[PDB]
Design an enzyme around this catalytic site. Structure first.
Site, short mmCIF file in Angstrom:
data_model
loop_
_atom_site.label_atom_id
_atom_site.label_comp_id
_atom_site.label_asym_id
_atom_site.label_seq_id
_atom_site.Cartn_x
_atom_site.Cartn_y
_atom_site.Cartn_z
N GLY A 195 4.46 -51.39 -31.13
CA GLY A 195 3.21 -51.00 -31.77
C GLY A 195 3.39 -49.78 -32.67
O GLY A 195 2.54 -49.51 -33.53
N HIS A 212 7.59 -57.42 -41.19
CA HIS A 212 7.60 -58.20 -39.95
C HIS A 212 6.19 -58.29 -39.31
O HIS A 212 6.03 -59.02 -38.34
CB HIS A 212 8.68 -57.78 -38.96
CG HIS A 212 8.42 -56.48 -38.28
ND1 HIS A 212 9.20 -55.37 -38.53
CD2 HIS A 212 7.51 -56.17 -37.33
CE1 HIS A 212 8.72 -54.41 -37.75
NE2 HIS A 212 7.71 -54.83 -37.01
N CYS A 251 5.70 -49.49 -35.06
CA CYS A 251 6.22 -49.90 -36.36
C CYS A 251 5.24 -49.55 -37.47
O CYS A 251 4.03 -49.64 -37.26
CB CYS A 251 6.56 -51.38 -36.38
SG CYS A 251 7.71 -51.85 -35.07
O1 LIG Z 1 11.88 -53.43 -31.97
C1 LIG Z 1 10.79 -53.92 -31.71
C2 LIG Z 1 9.53 -53.09 -31.83
C3 LIG Z 1 9.78 -51.70 -31.31
C4 LIG Z 1 9.85 -51.44 -29.94
C5 LIG Z 1 10.15 -50.16 -29.50
C6 LIG Z 1 10.37 -49.18 -30.45
N1 LIG Z 1 10.31 -49.41 -31.77
C7 LIG Z 1 10.02 -50.65 -32.17
N2 LIG Z 1 10.67 -55.19 -31.26
C8 LIG Z 1 9.43 -55.77 -30.70
C9 LIG Z 1 9.64 -57.26 -30.84
C10 LIG Z 1 11.15 -57.41 -30.62
C11 LIG Z 1 11.76 -56.17 -31.30
C12 LIG Z 1 12.19 -56.43 -32.72
N3 LIG Z 1 13.38 -56.78 -33.11
O2 LIG Z 1 13.25 -56.85 -34.52
C13 LIG Z 1 11.98 -56.52 -34.79
C14 LIG Z 1 11.55 -56.44 -36.20
C15 LIG Z 1 11.96 -57.54 -37.13
C16 LIG Z 1 12.59 -56.21 -37.26
N4 LIG Z 1 11.29 -56.26 -33.74
#
Ligand SMILES: O=C(Cc1cccnc1)N1CCC[C@H]1c1noc(C2CC2)n1
Ligand SMILES: O=C(Cc1cccnc1)N1CCC[C@H]1c1noc(C2CC2)n1
EC number: 3.4.19.12
Lengths: 304, 304
Positions: free
Chosen positions: A143, A41, A145
């Site tokens: 951030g 992603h 990820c």
């Molecule tokens: O989850 C996160 C990032 C995050 C934030 C907090 C903790 N751990 C990860 N996000 C940020 C953008 C919107 C959402 C999201 N939904 O799917 C995706 C990826 C395609 C799989 N991302």
């Protein structure tokens, strides 16, 4: 004595963390040998995230669009490919700090350490468990990820998790290092509810053994039970059913303490039925399930 | 989101751990530049430990009696001296992995990470707090002496603790890196009881702010209190008195959440008076006090 939620020393993993940027998106990557592993992603824009066609998005990307930085030095990207939900970026330099490593897909109930990273830099380390519903209750912000979960056997780092997303429920989902999600989750910003988060019974029992070893014995009772009787109680309290495999894994702790596994199940049964009555076990006011029987033995023997 | 007991990444400290042996005693040492720091009780035999005369025991020791091993390589000892309860072994090689570092003596209530080591090798990392009675509730077994506590500000490692002993109560005592014990403890195998272990009020409040940020809001109430009224309650529950300095340190969390420090004190007062009623806050069934306000801000902002 004393018992803590202990993580593995993170040094070997810190040496692998890099920053990966594609367009306006920056996340973490794992540099092992001449490959950088990161969530696919990274190629998504905020609009793309709602329903991305990764194969179509990746066609518009070339090696030069993946900016990979290890500390303050830029790595040259000579190849890229998608394996399930991870991208593998082939770089022209083998990471000199690559430890002895393996890629393992863990079982629900297993624990691991997470090195949370932002912009390729480590911020902290903590101990985790893969929940029976295949989510992890981590501490991750946007951030983070690409931050990875791992275990260490002397010199070998077994990578088991790469962080991909946060569910609307605040729990975390990710993949193994082959890019396959744990559980039913997809890398798409959509409603994905987690299943019932059951308690990891074998881990709670392992933690009760750790309590006895460390002096906390108040919960030991005069009773015993059977696997079938215990499991009727475990089902009512949304605990995982205990199997003979679990009893076998608890064997060394049972031998060390002299408390038969079924006697400890009877203590656990009374604690489920009666609660702790305002008392604590190893400084906790609830039954802890994120220590495996191996974690208890490792911590209680001082394995390095 | 999510909130975990997070330790600093331990890499910078792992690169400093060595094994120190004197006679039949082996413990951990900290190699920074051309000096190895370790507990002076490395010169003690099991008999000596009951009432050691360290100055007299050290007279019988020469540089060649201190065996210092960094991984699999032996360091040459060219000088030795005792500073309070630590020995400083001057070696002929500067540690090439010496990070940017400081030696700091922490205040009660402050938190730090511990890299537990055995035979100069790291086994795990966990987060700690220096208790108001100057003990630490660690996880340490025999052979862990010389393991250190530290904090990290970007690239600078501030060493604050060196493990020396376990009290008969199962709690831990040690020194700063100048060899001065925290609290009244002496490096002697004798009855040393710890004082009242009070709760670190400013940390519990910081953790309540972390709970609100992460979505756990059930404990927020319609009340307020004053510092004096709050402190009457804190005294009854063996909590540290809250000062205006503590309120000031909680300022950024108060600003971020919009919950005035005294309103959060009123929520805390009700939680002390009524208990949690079988509910949890950030997965805990008790009030957590081993997160400082700085830890909460750091974790909730993603500082690397
Ligand atoms: O989850 C996160 C990032 C995050 C934030 C907090 C903790 N751990 C990860 N996000 C940020 C953008 C919107 C959402 C999201 N939904 O799917 C995706 C990826 C395609 C799989 N991302
Ligand atoms: O405490 C430990 C080691 C240990 C064990 C568990 C956890 N952490 C440390 N010991 C071992 C020998 C007897 C006792 C002891 N009493 O004083 C001393 C030193 C002189 C200060 N040592």
């Amino acid at each position: 004595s004393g018992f803590r939620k202990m993580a593995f020393p993170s040094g070997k993993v810190e040496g692998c963390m890099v920053q990966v940027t594609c367009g306006t998106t920056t996340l973490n990557g794992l540099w092992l040998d001449d490959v950088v592993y990161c969530p696919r992603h990274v190629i998504c824009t905020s609009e793309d995230m709602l329903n991305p066609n990764y194969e179509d998005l990746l066609i518009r990307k070339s090696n030069h669009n993946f900016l990979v930085q290890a500390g303050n030095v830029q790595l040259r990207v000579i190849g890229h490919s998608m394996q399930n939900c991870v991208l593998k970026l082939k770089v022209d330099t083998a990471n000199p700090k690559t430890p002895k490593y393996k890629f393992v897909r863990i079982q629900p109930g297993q624990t691991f350490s997470v090195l949370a990273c932002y912009n390729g830099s480590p911020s902290g380390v903590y101990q985790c468990a893969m929940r029976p519903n295949f989510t992890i209750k981590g501490s991750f912000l946007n951030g983070s990820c690409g931050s990875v979960g791992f275990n260490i056997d002397y010199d070998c780092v077994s990578f088991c998790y790469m962080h991909h997303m946060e569910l609307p429920t605040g729990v975390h989902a990710g993949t193994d290092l082959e890019g396959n999600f744990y559980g039913p989750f997809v890398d798409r910003q959509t409603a994905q509810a987690a299943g019932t988060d059951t308690t990891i019974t074998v881990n709670v029992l392992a933690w009760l053994y750790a309590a006895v070893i460390n002096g906390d014995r108040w919960f030991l009772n005069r009773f015993t039970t059977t696997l079938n009787d215990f499991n009727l109680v475990a089902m009512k309290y949304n605990y995982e059913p205990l199997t003979q495999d679990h009893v076998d894994i608890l064997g060394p702790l049972s031998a060390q303490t002299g408390i038969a596994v079924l006697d400890m199940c009877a203590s656990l049964k009374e604690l489920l039925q009666n609660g702790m009555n305002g008392r604590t076990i190893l400084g906790s006011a609830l039954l802890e399930d994120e220590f495996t029987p191996f974690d208890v033995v490792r911590q209680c023997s001082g394995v390095t």
